[PDB]
């Protein structure tokens, strides 16, 4: 019953998220984390980043007919984590084989030629450790890059470069 | 005026494709066509494009553990079409919703800031007219840009701009 | 919204349904469809089935005190669809979580050790396509078994196996 | 192999139809629709109507020596449409002048003194809509009564006075 406050996550409520229609649950503890980037434009302020989390959701919900933004979490260059489908709802970010067994976090921006600032990277790792402390992720979870499970440039070369060094990454 | 009347396709063996291990079939006539790009590099000769079709397949078969290259057909800038999974086999290029009901054709290259050459676009429209002539594609099939059904930049800003002018493009 | 008033539905007055007292509405377009069975007596003729539809409403209204037959539509082995609360009104067939966001259709009979006849499955499917055309359902709607969203045997072992092969089925 | 047909048509084989041998094709989109009655017995259940469709085809095949049942589609009082020669084959229901430019639908029964139940009327109109839906009929298609293109009592007094009230009816 150990209680920690590892969630310095901006709530859907707070980034003006449209309401989710998703009902399918992940079974904890989740063993995989798949890292992607939106490939889109980036933000570096709480205000713009909240606004960007919105556009990403608008795209998935309005243009694509999805029950909610596809990621469980989004990482801003502002150093904040934006709540997506969360720890308990199966996301739609890495395909039918990986979605039901993973948490998909995506960095807001295109990282083919830039690396996300340290605070975005710090936000991501602290987010994952958080998950472990909650029991949402296996203490020994594995990190995959989006391009490792689906044909895509995601999460971007430079950021892909970075996640390959991470302690929990696995081929 | 009689039977086998359509398009020139570089066959699997001619580009050295690894044997296909896929078996799930499409239901002809197919109604949808999803246009993508590889997002990687391009080619402009029988030899380089036949080399590239191989890589793309390699990526999808080794690195992604798939039964065959994800696309039904790949388009080269050498103005030729490369047999992928073909007309009758369910591909893996657009998600579990569109894959079973569409034919995915991928242009080899990256077209965000670059358009395919005239002959690659002819090769592609010619392939479709061929799909119709054979009863593999509905007479009134619909063309979709990858970004219209999956979150991605595919098939690149420029190509995306082009397929939307197409007779069979339905938003 | 659109001109294709669709398919054939036996209207309320024809199967002689007591007037409905329901008022809550579903929001168009609806994302989910929950298939169930009545676990009651089966019928195979326009006359026998109308009677059966009447019995189900009767049980729901008179004994369970609902504002109307719980299902949005009922499906007879006579191969005809029967109107229930319709496409616009919130039904009562899958609990508090699902009734507000779904369309519940029910095959009239006990499909534990029987399958409904081909025509019944055809009417059921036609109804859904019709729903899409009308805009009552999402083009990318989802079909769920009653047992997937509630603790029940419904819609029967046989029919459950059958709805799993529907292109819109998502577990 | 995908969801069944609009109009919930009973397929040739489901009513144990003898294989067709007709080859002349209709040039859909077709302009006219001719409504006739079989002047045979009527039926009001799928079982009795499957047998009636069998009987009508057998009289056309065994006795008149035709390539198949004359009507493109048959309608039962059970409220189902039965597949005849379908949307693509020239019929043999209205004469050398009409069969080449029409779709012939026939109500199973004698409607001189009787009327067909609403469900039979509904299947018919829906079948017609399902026609254009598929693109087998022209948008502004015209409905003619059998006795409007040939000297005959078909489709009977009662049914004839009804189809006059239909919206797409003519002279
Ligand atoms: C809305 C609708 O019914 N559309 C029809 C459908 O019945 C059929 O399954 C499909 C494939 O042939 O052709 C469409 O025209």
UniProtKB/Swiss-Prot annotation, chains A, B, C, D:
SUPFAM superfamilies: N-acetylmuramoyl-L-alanine amidase-like (SSF55846). GO terms for cellular component: extracellular region. Residues 28-156 form the N-acetylmuramoyl-L-alanine amidase domain. The keyword Lipoprotein does not apply. GO terms for molecular function: N-acetylmuramoyl-L-alanine amidase activity; peptidoglycan binding; peptidoglycan immune receptor activity; zinc ion binding. Its main location: secreted. It comes from the Eukaryota. It is found in: Secreted; Cytoplasmic granule. Disulfide bonds join 6-130, 22-67, 43-49. Homotetramer. Innate immunity protein that plays several important functions in antimicrobial and antitumor defense systems. Acts as a pattern receptor that binds to murein peptidoglycans (PGN) of Gram-positive bacteria and thus provides bactericidal activity. Forms an equimolar complex with heat shock protein HSPA1A and induces programmed cell death through apoptosis and necroptosis in tumor cell lines by activating the TNFR1 receptor on the target cell membrane. In addition, acts in complex with the Ca(2+)-binding protein S100A4 as a chemoattractant able to induce lymphocyte movement. Belongs to the N-acetylmuramoyl-L-alanine amidase 2 family. This is Peptidoglycan recognition protein 1. It comes from Camelus dromedarius (Dromedary).
